[PDB]
Amino acid sequence: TLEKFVDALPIPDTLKPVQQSKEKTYYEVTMEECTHQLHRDLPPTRLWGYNGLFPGPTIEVKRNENVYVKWMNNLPSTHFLPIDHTIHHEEPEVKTVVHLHGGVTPDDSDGYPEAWFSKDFEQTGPYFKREVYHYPNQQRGAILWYHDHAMALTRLNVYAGLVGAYIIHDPKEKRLKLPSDEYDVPLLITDRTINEDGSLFYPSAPENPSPSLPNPSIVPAFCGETILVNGKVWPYLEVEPRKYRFRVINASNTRTYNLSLDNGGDFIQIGSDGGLLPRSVKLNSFSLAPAERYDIIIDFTAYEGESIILANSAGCGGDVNPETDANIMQFRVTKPLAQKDESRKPKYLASYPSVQHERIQNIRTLKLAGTQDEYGRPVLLLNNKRWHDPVTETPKVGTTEIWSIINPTRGTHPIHLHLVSFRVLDRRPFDIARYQESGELSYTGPAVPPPPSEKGWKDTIQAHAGEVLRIAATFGPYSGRYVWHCHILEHEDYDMMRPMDITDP
Numbered sequence: 001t002l003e004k005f006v007d008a009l010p011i012p013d014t015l016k017p018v019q020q021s022k023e024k025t026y027y028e029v030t031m032e033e034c035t036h037q038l039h040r041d042l043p044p045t046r047l048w049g050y051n052g053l054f055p056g057p058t059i060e061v062k063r064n065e066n067v068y069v070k071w072m073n074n075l076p077s078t079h080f081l082p083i084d085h086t087i088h089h090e091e092p093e094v095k096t097v098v099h100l101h102g103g104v105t106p107d108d109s110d111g112y113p114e115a116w117f118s119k120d121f122e123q124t125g126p127y128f129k130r131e132v133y134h135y136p137n138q139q140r141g142a143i144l145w146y147h148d149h150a151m152a153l154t155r156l157n158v159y160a161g162l163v164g165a166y167i168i169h170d171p172k173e174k175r176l177k178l179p180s181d182e183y184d185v186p187l188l189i190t191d192r193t194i195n196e197d198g199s200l201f202y203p204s205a206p207e208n209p210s211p212s213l214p215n216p217s218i219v220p221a222f223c224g225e226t227i228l229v230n231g232k233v234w235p236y237l238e239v240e241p242r243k244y245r246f247r248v249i250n251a252s253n254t255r256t257y258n259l260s261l262d263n264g265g266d267f268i269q270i271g272s273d274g275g276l277l278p279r280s281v282k283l284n285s286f287s288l289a290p291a292e293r294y295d296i297i298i299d300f301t302a303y304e305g306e307s308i309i310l311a312n313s314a315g316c317g318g319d320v321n322p323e324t325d326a327n328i329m330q331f332r333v334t335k336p337l338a339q340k341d342e343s344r345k346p347k348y349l350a351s352y353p354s355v356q357h358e359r360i361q362n363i364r365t366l367k368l369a370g371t372q373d374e375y376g377r378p379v380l381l382l383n384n385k386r387w388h389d390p391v392t393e394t395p396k397v398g399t400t401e402i403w404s405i406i407n408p409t410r411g412t413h414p415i416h417l418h419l420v421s422f423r424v425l426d427r428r429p430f431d432i433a434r435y436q437e438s439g440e441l442s443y444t445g446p447a448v449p450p451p452p453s454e455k456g457w458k459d460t461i462q463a464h465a466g467e468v469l470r471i472a473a474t475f476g477p478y479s480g481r482y483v484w485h486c487h488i489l490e491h492e493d494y495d496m497m498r499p500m501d502i503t504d505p
């Protein structure tokens with residue numbers, strides 16, 4: 001097992017524009033097969049990287065900044081990870097498309113799974129319109145991130161290394177004096193399994209595969225043996241004894257983390273997926289499922305000299321192993337102060353989302369279910385529909401709906417809707433055997449309103465087993481063709497994803 005905390009945390013450089021003016025900012029990002037050492041003791045690992053980097057470069061934009069990105073595929077024509085040809089039915093093997101997660105984006109710049117392109121746009125999927133994506137950024141300051149979304153290949157192209165951070169800065173938040181600049185640090189967390197030769201391992205089949213199974217075969221879940229942050233296995237970060245802001249992004253395929261500091265110190269949560277909370281929240285720990293973001297302050301002022309482990313208590317296919325996946329990274333409070341800490345950790349951050357009083361146009365009830373294929377594998381389905389079935393989720397532009405998500409399965413699914421952020425209304429336990437036998441929904445306890453961490457704006461939300469989760473979303477300001485899906489990539493690809501039409505009457 002790799003020795004923990006021997007590599008310094010990489011800080012991705014901030015991408016420089018190819019062209020910028022006051023009316024427009026223009027970037028170019030090229031997907032490249034590259035090699036990078038992931039740990040002191042490993043040979044360099046072959047990866048797919050935005051601009052040949054893992055993670056990709058951090059993009060930083062201002063609210064309402066008029067941004068264009070030309071995302072280019074300059075990858076090999078063959079993949080290096082195991083492709084299952086039975087999950088989707090002449091197309092190029094390597095297909096890519098960039099989704100800016102949390103982006104308030106016109107539909108043809110949103111990275112629709114069927115808007116894929118091969119190397120140099122030589123072949124393009126049926127929903128492809130444009131090479132240069134347009135991000136108007138007319139939305140709250142928040143932590144976003146970008147990753148590959150290509151139909152039936154997401155779990156592989158993301159696992160290969162196609163992820164990066166994207167920060168929107170709202171200049172009206174500056175007066176809050178949150179830690180900034182070098183004291184504001186993204187933490188992109190990805191679990192990986194790495195072979196002795198340093199090559200990525202991703203399973204070609206379930207363990208002890210029925211001889212029925214195809215080869216390769218998709219697996220329902222991926223749990224990595226090692227944890228990386230910003231592309232290094234279990235790294236350390238040297239910090240000054242003062243306040244830092246961290247943008248924590250879970251960029252893992254399946255794995256959920258439950259994070260804490262091993263010296264018992266607090267996080268101060270200042271933000272969720274959709275931006276600043278109305279009030280900061282002190283937390284001893286927090287759950288973070290794939291695609292969720294936490295915007296937090298950690299105060300190292302009282303901890304000079306100490307080494308503090310960011311620890312993880314959430315299992316993935318089993319309990320955490322204290323020597324490995326119980327560890328994320330280590331902070332070392334040994335860097336001298338560069339200047340007085342002038343940052344703040346204010347209580348009052350933003351307006352409450354509940355100041356809004358929108359009419360409920362529609363209430364959808366959606367179930368998380370599935371079936372078994374001709375090979376005996378589980379196929380995960382939203383409302384027992386396939387991706388290819390005619391669209392059923394058709395909200396009207398400008399209106400607000402409540403979605404009631406029924407989860408009678410054994411696990412949590414982190415549910416994500418494109419375009420919008422939403423409010424969490426409540427969660428409520430129900431009798432699973434009764435639901436499965438009759439389709440009748442019988443509650444076993446009262447509704448539970450969201451904890452303070454879920455009283456801001458969310459875009460990816462944990463829907464736990466044996467519960468009904470209700471959220472409220474306003475669909476806008478764009479109309480068009482989007483998606484909603486589980487953000488466990490192994491579920492998403494087979495087949496837990498649905499189109500979503502936002503209609504203009």
Ligand SMILES: [O-][O-]
Nearest residue numbers: 099101416487
């Ligand atoms: O990921 O959407």
Ligand SMILES: [Cu+2]
Nearest residue numbers: 099101147291
């Ligand atoms: Cu995403």
Ligand SMILES: [Cu+2]
Nearest residue numbers: 101102417418
């Ligand atoms: Cu998204």
Ligand SMILES: [Cu+2]
Nearest residue numbers: 413486488491
């Ligand atoms: Cu799922």
Ligand SMILES: [Cu+2]
Nearest residue numbers: 099149483485
């Ligand atoms: Cu998506």
